[PDB]
RNA sequence: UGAGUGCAGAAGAGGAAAGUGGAAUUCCAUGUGUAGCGGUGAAAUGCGCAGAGAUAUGGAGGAACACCAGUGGCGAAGGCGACUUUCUGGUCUGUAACUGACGCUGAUGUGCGAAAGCGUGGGGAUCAAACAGGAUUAGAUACCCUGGUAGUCCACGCCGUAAACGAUGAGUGCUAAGUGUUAGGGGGCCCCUUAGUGCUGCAGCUAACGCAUUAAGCACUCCGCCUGGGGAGUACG
């Protein structure tokens, strides 16, 4: 089962928490049963609308090869409470 | 969830119960327990100051920890026991170092179940945080209100309370009853909401089993006599007879508010009702 | 007329991809219809999900 | 179910090996998806066009049953004391 | 009393029953309005094309005391009433930088009343 | 050959639990600023100088998911429309490995069943029975207007109805054509063919209207139902 998780940083965070965090998050969809067929990251890009005064936020897709679905629960419940995250996309394909 | 017992007689005829059946023993820890003797609403004076109390079961007091100062370790749930002292179900949690102590059992805590404290941990249910480390919309409860004290707005059943916002060192929480108050960051808090959630359904059928709770029968103030209570006297039963209804002792009681307005809340308070 | 992606042979259509979507959009980040752009209904149906996940993760405006 | 659980299990009841249409495989099939259907609805109770599906996978595995039955008893009572329906 | 402000916006919101104009900064604080009701406009009059005409002239005419030569245009509602606000906007000695016909339309939210049978 | 399985493929608002999002309405608080707003065939009640409405910012909360959207799709029907994950059913095409009539219909029975309604417990923005007021009118316990409780919303139960309509029972087969569309397949943009979905139309049928390869035709099988109108879908059980 090969899903796709895309989200978002919020632009304020300083690069040193910010590369930790991903090294969290890719650590997660990757250390509970599965593994990763690649990490990417685009930048900083615009946004279409604004998400709590924010305009501008960062993208990162990890697109995870996986089965049983801990990992990705797992992650979207964590990005709920990271304020450091504002959105949060999975798509099975 | 619920027992209906069968209408055999007229006292089981419309009662319901609890099935008890998120209770895994009975006996309890013989090291946390201390005595409660009934008082009854009888002051230091020996007076009865508060109505409607006494003659019920006798007690034994399970001693819980509303504070949670043990962080960092890591607890197991052992039991989710009784406690007639309460409307809640607890939970016997046995620390790592090798403690056992209760705590108030939320709804959908299980055996075996891992529960931690402090400010850097989990924000699953049963751990104890801070109102900072809590974030926003999270349901919880045993707020304390004083950090060191212990929890004091959420320890009934089905009970629980919600963070909207911060306004920097304090926070925001919509209890239950609907009332804003805005609290303060330090103190903690737990995930979830209080469990036996359906103490609040329990029909009681008897006299006698609101009697074995410890509670003596109200009289009503249009039976009593005009030294007795103002609502009272009259040839035939006879109505109020007042602008406004009264209570025992003199203070008028449906709508009349009896707050304190020069109290240290009334700014920490947002919205009320 | 003529289905574009039909045309070009692509298959499967990407959330992702703001500039191959943000032609089948009017204006006002409006969808725009069939009878407009000359696609199939296959992947009309396909634009309409990508085109709203893409709304979505904030690659393009609902407005 | 996936083809891998199914072919698990019609290798093991199959009369012979290219067959894999007899009444024994299919009813066996069938009892495997009946089953996983019913444990999914002890969780979603409520999603009564999944039992209906039930209720025709049921009603066919008892026509292949009866069929069975009258054709020879023998794999009838061998199947149905294999699969436990009785 | 004085307040210098070169550029702001111009409401217009027109309805089948009134129109109101209002004149703000570019930051949604009032500087002036108009009605036909504060015209005096009363019945099938509020919903003409002259009373906005004239409550744009009025309101143009109580902002430019403030000093206003440019404004934005800012539309919403139904009704024949926009278009010769705005042409009578021009004619206020004011300058129109941008129309924008912006109007609360939902994505099928709220239920709306009943029918009227008249 | 029919009916079913398998293998390779396709589509899909089919269903169920959780999770995310944006536009809008309402409410609140603050700023600006002042004379009405709203509504009408026309007016008034209502709100408003205690600063409304407009406007900007922000927040709370509930409901429904604009554009895509289509005589389009799916579902046994009822019904299903944001997006996502998990679970799950059924259907279509091709093949021709596989079983070899296992099929059809189906009384009693069982179970699903719009909307309203009921019970419990939550929730509660909009809309809105009843209710109040204004207006209209010979009168108006109506239309129209301002408001507004149940209710609409969620879970677990119950009811068990509808112009629940295609007013057309289910299954199978034969009977001219033409043209659009949906998901597929084979051949060389065109042809041919499966299963659906619309229009026009010959034979035939029909009391006429009209149906007409999605029959209301030709025929067979099974089930239910009608036997003048009212009383009466009443009464007793
Ligand atoms: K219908
Ligand atoms: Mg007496
Ligand atoms: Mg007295
Ligand atoms: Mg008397
Ligand atoms: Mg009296
Ligand atoms: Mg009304
Ligand atoms: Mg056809």
Same mark, same amino acid.
């Given at each position: 089962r090969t899903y796709e998780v895309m989200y978002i940083v919020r632009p304020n965070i300083e690069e040193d928490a910010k590369k930790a965090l991903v090294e969290r998050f890719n650590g997660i969809l990757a250390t509970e049963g599965a593994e990763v067929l690649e990490a990417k990251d685009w930048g900083k890009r615009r946004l279409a609308y604004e998400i709590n005064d924010f305009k501008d936020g960062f993208y990162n897709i990890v697109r995870v090869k996986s089965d049983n679905n801990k990992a990705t629960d797992e992650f979207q419940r964590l990005a709920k409470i990271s304020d450091d995250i504002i959105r949060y996309m999975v798509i099975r394909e | 969830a619920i027992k209906k017992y069968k209408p055999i007689t007229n006292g089981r005829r419309n009662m319901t119960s609890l099935?008890? $059946?998120?209770? =895994?023993?009975?006996?309890?820890?013989? &090291? +946390?327990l201390k005595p409660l003797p009934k008082? $009854? @609403? !009888?002051? #230091?004076? @020996?007076? +009865? =100051?508060? !109505?409607?109390?006494g003659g019920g079961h006798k007690r034994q007091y399970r001693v819980i920890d509303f504070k949670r100062n043990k962080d960092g370790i890591n607890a197991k749930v052992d039991s989710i026991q009784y406690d007639p002292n309460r409307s809640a179900n607890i939970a016997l949690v046995v620390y790592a170092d090798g403690e056992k102590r209760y705590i108030i059992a939320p709804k959908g805590l299980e055996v075996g179940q891992i529960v931690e404290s402090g400010a850097? $941990?989990?924000?699953?249910? @049963?751990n104890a945080l801070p109102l900072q480390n809590i974030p926003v919309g999270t349901v919880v409860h045993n707020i304390e209100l004083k950090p060191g004290k212990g929890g004091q707005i959420a320890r009934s059943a089905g009970a629980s309370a919600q963070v909207l916002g911060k306004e920097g060192k304090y926070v925001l929480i919509r209890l239950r009853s609907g009332e804003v108050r805005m609290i303060l960051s330090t103190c903690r808090a737990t995930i979830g909401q209080v469990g036996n959630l359906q103490h609040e359904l329990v029909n009681v059928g008897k006299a006698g089993r609101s009697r074995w709770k410890g509670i003596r029968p109200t009289v009503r103030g &249009?039976?009593? #006599?005009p030294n007795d209570h103002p609502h009272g006297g009259g040839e035939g039963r006879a109505p109020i007879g007042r602008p406004s209804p009264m209570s025992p002792w003199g203070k008028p009681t449906l709508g009349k508010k009896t707050r304190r307005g020069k109290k240290s809340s009334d700014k920490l308070i947002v919205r009320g009702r | 007329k003529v289905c574009y992606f039909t045309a070009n042979g692509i298959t499967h259509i990407d959330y992702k991809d703001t500039e191959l979507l943000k032609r089948f959009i009017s204006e006002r980040g409006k969808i725009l219809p069939r009878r407009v752009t000359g696609t199939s209904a296959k992947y009309q149906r396909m634009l309409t999900t990508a085109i709203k996940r893409s709304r979505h993760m904030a690659l393009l405006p609902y407005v | 179910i996936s083809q891998e659980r199914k072919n698990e299990i019609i290798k093991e009841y199959r009369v012979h090996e290219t067959d894999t249409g007899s009444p024994e495989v299919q009813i066996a099939v069938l009892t495997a998806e009946i089953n996983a259907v019913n444990e999914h609805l002890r969780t979603h109770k409520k999603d009564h066009h999944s039992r209906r599906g039930l209720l025709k996978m049921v009603g066919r595995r008892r026509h292949l049953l009866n069929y069975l039955r009258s054709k020879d008893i023998q794999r009838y009572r061998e199947l149905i004391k294999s699969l436990g329906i009785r | 009393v004085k307040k210098n402000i070169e550029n702001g916006v111009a409401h217009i919101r027109s309805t089948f029953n009134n129109t109101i104009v209002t004149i703000t900064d570019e930051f949604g604080n009032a500087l002036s309005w108009s009605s036909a009701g504060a015209l005096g406009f009363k019945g099938s009059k509020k919903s003409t094309p002259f009373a906005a005409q004239m409550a744009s002239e009025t309101a143009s005419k109580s902002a430019m005391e403030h000093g206003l030569k440019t404004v934005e245009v800012t539309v919403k509602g139904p009704g024949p009433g926009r278009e010769s606000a705005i042409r009578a906007l021009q004619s206020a000695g004011l300058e129109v930088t941008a129309i924008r016909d912006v109007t609360p339309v939902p994505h099928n939210g709220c239920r709306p009343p009943k029918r009227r049978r008249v």
């Amino acid at each position: 089962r090969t899903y796709e998780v895309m989200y978002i940083v919020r632009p304020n965070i300083e690069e040193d928490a910010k590369k930790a965090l991903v090294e969290r998050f890719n650590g997660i969809l990757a250390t509970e049963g599965a593994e990763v067929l690649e990490a990417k990251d685009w930048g900083k890009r615009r946004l279409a609308y604004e998400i709590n005064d924010f305009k501008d936020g960062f993208y990162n897709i990890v697109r995870v090869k996986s089965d049983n679905n801990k990992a990705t629960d797992e992650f979207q419940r964590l990005a709920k409470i990271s304020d450091d995250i504002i959105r949060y996309m999975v798509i099975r394909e | 969830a619920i027992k209906k017992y069968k209408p055999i007689t007229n006292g089981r005829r419309n009662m319901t119960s609890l099935d008890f $059946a998120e209770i =895994t023993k009975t006996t309890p820890e013989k &090291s +946390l327990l201390k005595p409660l003797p009934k008082k $009854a @609403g !009888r002051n #230091n004076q @020996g007076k +009865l =100051t508060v !109505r409607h109390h006494g003659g019920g079961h006798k007690r034994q007091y399970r001693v819980i920890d509303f504070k949670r100062n043990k962080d960092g370790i890591n607890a197991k749930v052992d039991s989710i026991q009784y406690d007639p002292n309460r409307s809640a179900n607890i939970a016997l949690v046995v620390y790592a170092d090798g403690e056992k102590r209760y705590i108030i059992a939320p709804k959908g805590l299980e055996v075996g179940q891992i529960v931690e404290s402090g400010a850097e $941990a989990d924000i699953k249910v @049963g751990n104890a945080l801070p109102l900072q480390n809590i974030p926003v919309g999270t349901v919880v409860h045993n707020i304390e209100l004083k950090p060191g004290k212990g929890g004091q707005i959420a320890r009934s059943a089905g009970a629980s309370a919600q963070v909207l916002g911060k306004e920097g060192k304090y926070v925001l929480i919509r209890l239950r009853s609907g009332e804003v108050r805005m609290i303060l960051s330090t103190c903690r808090a737990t995930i979830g909401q209080v469990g036996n959630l359906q103490h609040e359904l329990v029909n009681v059928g008897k006299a006698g089993r609101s009697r074995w709770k410890g509670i003596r029968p109200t009289v009503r103030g &249009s039976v009593m #006599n005009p030294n007795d209570h103002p609502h009272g006297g009259g040839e035939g039963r006879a109505p109020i007879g007042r602008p406004s209804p009264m209570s025992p002792w003199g203070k008028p009681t449906l709508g009349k508010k009896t707050r304190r307005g020069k109290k240290s809340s009334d700014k920490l308070i947002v919205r009320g009702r | 007329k003529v289905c574009y992606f039909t045309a070009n042979g692509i298959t499967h259509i990407d959330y992702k991809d703001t500039e191959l979507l943000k032609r089948f959009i009017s204006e006002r980040g409006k969808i725009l219809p069939r009878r407009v752009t000359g696609t199939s209904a296959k992947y009309q149906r396909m634009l309409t999900t990508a085109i709203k996940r893409s709304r979505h993760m904030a690659l393009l405006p609902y407005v | 179910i996936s083809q891998e659980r199914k072919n698990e299990i019609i290798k093991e009841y199959r009369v012979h090996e290219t067959d894999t249409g007899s009444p024994e495989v299919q009813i066996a099939v069938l009892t495997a998806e009946i089953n996983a259907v019913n444990e999914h609805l002890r969780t979603h109770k409520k999603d009564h066009h999944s039992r209906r599906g039930l209720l025709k996978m049921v009603g066919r595995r008892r026509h292949l049953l009866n069929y069975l039955r009258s054709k020879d008893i023998q794999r009838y009572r061998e199947l149905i004391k294999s699969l436990g329906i009785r | 009393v004085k307040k210098n402000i070169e550029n702001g916006v111009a409401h217009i919101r027109s309805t089948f029953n009134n129109t109101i104009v209002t004149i703000t900064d570019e930051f949604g604080n009032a500087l002036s309005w108009s009605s036909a009701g504060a015209l005096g406009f009363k019945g099938s009059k509020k919903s003409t094309p002259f009373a906005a005409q004239m409550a744009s002239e009025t309101a143009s005419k109580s902002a430019m005391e403030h000093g206003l030569k440019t404004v934005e245009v800012t539309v919403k509602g139904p009704g024949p009433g926009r278009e010769s606000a705005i042409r009578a906007l021009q004619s206020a000695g004011l300058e129109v930088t941008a129309i924008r016909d912006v109007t609360p339309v939902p994505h099928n939210g709220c239920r709306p009343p009943k029918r009227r049978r008249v």
